Structure 1
Amino acid sequence: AIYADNSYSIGNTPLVRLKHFGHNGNVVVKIEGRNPSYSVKCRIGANMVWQAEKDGTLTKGKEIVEPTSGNTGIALAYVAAARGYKLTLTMPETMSLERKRLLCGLGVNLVLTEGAKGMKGAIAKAEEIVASDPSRYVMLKQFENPANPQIHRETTGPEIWKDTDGKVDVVVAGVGTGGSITGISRAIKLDFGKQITSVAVEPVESPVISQTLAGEEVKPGPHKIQGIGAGFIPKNLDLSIIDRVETVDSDTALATARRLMAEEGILAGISSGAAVAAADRLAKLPEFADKLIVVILPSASERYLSTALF
């Protein structure tokens, strides 16, 4: 069990039972902060590169371009370093000094777009750079690349099945790209044949999934739950496998993450707090009190030292 590079070391993350949430230990958390670049995104960083290799879209000498600076940026950085690709991340110039340092530490060519243009600015500049030499550059496109949900169907989902001896009844996951809830749901429902409850979590401030499913007007909004609530339905969210959508507000997500830290001794990020607050609500409805709820904790606390978490 010696990994040929850090990308192969993804996953096999542990399940920890919560003591101050749920009812009689019915809430269990999967610690994705424990991964090579310390997030759930390590899985999709690995698999999107591996898949682009297998299909010939990524070869030696081609460069990677992606418009983000979040967990996926960090994940692609570690994989790119491990496997010998130059990586360019586009992002506004107004981004955190510390994220600049972390990504620069990881050997990323940083392209700081117009700050005023912001995120819009970066997506376009990605598209621009790729357009300039399409035989040289590849955008992996985390929101729509099937290799994203697929890695969750092959690793994250089976790990949950295994670790719970098939007892998992509910999976709660915040939605960013939708890959985690999609892949996990496909594994447990379709590969293992259990009719679990798949619960998507989104900020109450930007409840676009809830609005869409209700046939209401879609109204995205700003929030602090980093990693989720992109303000649209990503292609990698398979609405067909979602049984329930829970909304959580920023303050509750923050307070919940602090409780995870101070009361559970679990070093989780902001989205982790959101996912647990939603899980806790379900766990205290009599319909779910004899059911085993598994919650994805996407990242770790130290990535949030500059944020409202502290």
Structure 2
Amino acid sequence: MPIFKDNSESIGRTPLVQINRLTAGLSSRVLAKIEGRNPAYSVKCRIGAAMIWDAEQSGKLKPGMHVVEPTSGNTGIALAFVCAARGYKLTLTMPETMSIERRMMLKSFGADLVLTPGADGMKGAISKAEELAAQPGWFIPQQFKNPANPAIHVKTTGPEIWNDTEGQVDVFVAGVGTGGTITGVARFLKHEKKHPVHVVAVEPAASPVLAGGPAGRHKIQGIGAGFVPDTFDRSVVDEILSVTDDEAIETARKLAMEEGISCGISCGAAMAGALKVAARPEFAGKTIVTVLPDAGERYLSTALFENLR
């Protein structure tokens, strides 16, 4: 490995770990990519870095400009650590219904937070971010529209999976938030390596928007955005699979308990999908790869841990 000139350069190179007890009695192989092991501990670190780097290259972002994005979750954390490592002023807009601890993490990187009325929800944070981003000197990455999001997974996540498995990956299963992960990995495998792979998107059964149903409330943070994102390319996805909130929560708990993998709720969702796919007779002896986006300690205040006080 090189010496990274700042922490944003250290994204990726995450490990593939074989799942052993949740797969007991299957003849396929299930490998988990641990995206929790990133400079700011989630998969979003890849796109926080890539969207900043790409805006530098194109001139949309210049030194002294202000970065603004409407986000509570992992994307705010990634942008915060990247802007701190690379020296940009950062503002994040979020409804005031935001956990005091997620805000501490964001403020530890020196991000400025703009709370918008909780009643207007996410669309209120988006409106404020658009208003701020309209002024000159401010840049908005736009995580759901920015092609630099799937492109970094074409350049890093995709190749890492291809090379760590030595070309043995027959199924890729990924929860879909912005959809950049599943789009970039599928593009790399199918178009750049010409590799046959069955690509499965995972969404909450309570908000099955990718399969055409109506958005709803759900607890699988980071996926189920309530719309089909522009960064999600349905043409490289072969199947949509939904999981319940309880399946996701329980499978994340079993990943820690039975595999020693501390991970979040959407990790349980992805794995719960992957293990159902991996039980199909047509995939006997095949390799199923899935992504676990972040780590369990980010979920101490959530429903993931409520059974442990």
TM-score range, shorter chain: over 0.9
Aligned to 1:249: 244
Distance 1:64-1:99 versus aligned 2 partners, 3 A rule: same
Aligned to 2:160: 159
Aligned to 2:256: 261
Q: Aligned partners of 1:5, 1:25: CA distance in 2, in Å?
A: 40
Aligned to 2:207: 206
When normalised by structure 2's length, the TM-score is 0.96
For residues 66-81 of structure 1, the aligned pairs below 5 Å read 66-81=69-84
For residues 191-230 of structure 1, the aligned pairs below 5 Å read 191-211=192-212, 218-230=213-225
Aligned to 1:15: 16
Q: Which residue identity is paired with 2:61?
A: L
Q: Which residue identity is paired with 2:156?
A: T
Q: Does 1:118 align with 2:113?
A: no
Moved more, 103-112 or 24-33: 24-33
CA shift at 1:220, angstroms? 0.6
Q: Which residue identity is paired with 1:119?
A: M
CA shift at 1:265, angstroms? 0.3
Counterpart pick for 1:238 among 233, 238, 260: 233
Aligned to 2:176: 175
Aligned to 1:55: 58
For residues 126-145 of structure 1, the aligned pairs below 5 Å read 126-131=129-134, 133=135, 135-145=136-146
Q: Does 1:64 align with 2:67?
A: yes
Counterpart pick for 2:110 among 107, 112, 115: 107
CA shift at 1:178, angstroms? 0.4
Query: Per-residue CA shift, 1:11-31, capped at 9, x if unaligned?
Result: 000000001233246111000
Q: Which residue identity is paired with 2:91?
A: T
Counterpart pick for 1:277 among 249, 272, 277: 272
Aligned to 1:84: 87
Q: In the alignment, is the contact (CA less than 8 A) between 2:28 and 2:286 conserved in 1?
A: no
Q: Aligned partners of 1:159, 1:15: CA distance in 2, in Å?
A: 9
Aligned to 1:28: 31
Q: In the alignment, is the contact (CA less than 8 A) between 1:21 and 1:27 conserved in 2?
A: no
Q: Does 1:190 align with 2:191?
A: yes
Q: Aligned partners of 1:61, 1:232: CA distance in 2, in Å?
A: 34
RMSD: 0.8
Query: Per-residue CA shift, 1:69-101, capped at 9, x if unaligned?
Result: 210000000000000000000001120000111
Q: Which runs of 5+ in 1 are unaligned?
A: 212-217
When normalised by structure 1's length, the TM-score is 0.96
Q: In the alignment, is the contact (CA less than 8 A) between 2:28 and 2:285 conserved in 1?
A: no
Q: Aligned partners of 1:92, 1:240: CA distance in 2, in Å?
A: 34
Aligned to 1:214: none
CA shift at 1:164, angstroms? 0.2
Q: Which residue identity is paired with 2:129?
A: A
Q: Which residue identity is paired with 2:179?
A: G
Q: In the alignment, is the contact (CA less than 8 A) between 1:208 and 1:219 conserved in 2?
A: yes
Q: In the alignment, is the contact (CA less than 8 A) between 1:18 and 1:25 conserved in 2?
A: no
CA shift at 1:118, angstroms? 2.0
Q: Which residue identity is paired with 1:89?
A: L
Q: Which residue identity is paired with 2:267?
A: S
Q: Which residue identity is paired with 1:167?
A: Q
Q: Does 1:43 align with 2:46?
A: yes
Q: Aligned partners of 1:302, 1:39: CA distance in 2, in Å?
A: 11
Question: Which 4+ stretches in 1 moved above 2 angstroms?
Answer: none
Q: Which residue identity is paired with 2:281?
A: P
Q: Aligned partners of 1:271, 1:253: CA distance in 2, in Å?
A: 7
Q: In the alignment, is the contact (CA less than 8 A) between 1:17 and 1:25 conserved in 2?
A: no
Q: Aligned partners of 1:100, 1:71: CA distance in 2, in Å?
A: 11
Counterpart pick for 1:305 among 279, 300, 304: 300
